[PDB]
Write a protein that binds this ligand. Structure first.
Ligand SMILES: CCOC(=O)c1c(NC(=O)Cc2cccs2)sc2c1CCN(C(=O)OCC)C2
Ligand SMILES: [Zn+2]
Ligand SMILES: [Zn+2]
Length: 328
């Protein structure tokens, strides 16, 4: 009735779940490549989500396992480890003091469940690739947020497998609210929605409102869901805000993917995508490009919304940013 030494080493690593920069890769290793399941389960236990939502634990694990097994292990970046990381990062963002007691349990469950499934069954190529190659997925979803529609459809479809309906006890109301929210969040993970997401977020910041003991005031779905979308979006692009040790493995993995994608593009006639070009790609320039133009403005804006909560995070990102500049 006692944990194995591995289960234990694994538990201690998990003692870090509330902290930015958990070593998710070790956990991936320690758990036999179940980082998504153990972290999810840890988070679910930790937030008491099973009781609150009457989620049977065996059902929770079955779904978790099923879900994790639908990420591709043969995909360098968009796999269950990335899933797990985004989950845990979202987890941590939700705990930010500026948000204390702001969101309901259902909104938390949505944010976390969204993060868990937001890339599920990712082929490791981009929307544009899928579109240009005339792939089933692209045709299924009429070229619009192809991947993200697919992650959702799969994440929800997996609830129907044997003993997988983790939401079997929620009322229709809870379920419809959860579903809509989860959909709005995962749809907002599409990079082409970035600029708009940020705009709104800056606007939230600009037309800011706080209330009692100083935590964001949000008295409508549009505002609530926008913060959640930006939150999970931030987690999705949180890698450059992690300790360089983490950041670099993530860059390795993303670059492996882009290069592999550029490999399929180069042969299949297509002109090697942006930054995907093998040998002709500067990873260090691309990381500065990405940080300066996309990642920093997102996190700076997010940091404002939650000032001073995200300061260490934003600082890490700037350190990491300058670092890559060393590599020039
Ligand atoms: C060469 C740098 O590329 C990326 O890192 C990178 C992403 N990676 C991440 O999910 C976060 C990370 C930061 C560092 C390692 S992983 S998402 C993305 C890019 C290129 C520009 N994009 C974009 O604007 O549109 C694509 C649809 C989408
Ligand atoms: Zn995605
Ligand atoms: Zn992602």
């Amino acid at each position: 009735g006692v944990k194995t030494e591995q289960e234990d080493v694994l538990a201690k690593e998990l003692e870090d779940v509330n902290k930015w920069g958990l070593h998710v890769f070790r956990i991936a290793e320690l758990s036999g490549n179940r980082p998504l399941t153990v972290i999810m389960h840890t988070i679910f236990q930790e937030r008491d989500l099973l009781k609150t939502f009457k989620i049977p634990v065996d059902t929770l694990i079955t779904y978790l396992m099923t879900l994790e097994d639908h990420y591709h292990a043969d995909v360098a970046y968009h796999n269950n480890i990335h899933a797990a990381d985004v989950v845990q990062s979202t987890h941590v963002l939700l705990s930010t003091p500026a948000l204390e007691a702001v969101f309901t349990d259902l909104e938390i469950l949505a944010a976390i469940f969204a993060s868990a499934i937001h890339d599920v069954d990712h082929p490791g190529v981009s929307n544009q690739f899928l579109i240009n190659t005339n792939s089933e997925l692209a045709l299924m979803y009429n070229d619009s947020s192809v991947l993200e529609n697919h992650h959702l459809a799969v994440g929800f479809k997996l609830l129907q497998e044997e003993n997988c309906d983790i939401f079997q006890n929620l009322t229709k109301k809870q379920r419809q609210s959860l579903r809509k929210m989860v959909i709005d969040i995962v749809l907002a993970t599409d990079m082409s929605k970035h600029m708009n997401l940020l705009a709104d977020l800056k606007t939230m910041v600009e037309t800011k409102k706080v209330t009692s003991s100083g935590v964001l005031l949000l008295d409508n779905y549009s505002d609530r869901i926008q913060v959640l979308q930006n939150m999970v979006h931030c987690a999705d692009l949180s890698n450059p805000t992690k300790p360089l040790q983490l950041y670099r493995q993530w860059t390795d993995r993303i670059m492996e993917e882009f290069f592999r994608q550029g490999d399929r593009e180069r042969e299949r006639g297509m002109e090697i995508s942006p930054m995907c070009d093998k040998h002709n790609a500067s990873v260090e320039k691309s990381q500065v490009g990405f940080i300066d133009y996309i990642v920093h403005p997102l996190w700076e804006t997010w940091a404002d919304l939650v000032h001073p909560d995200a300061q260490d995070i934003l600082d890490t990102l700037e350190d990491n940013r300058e670092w890559y500049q060393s590599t020039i």
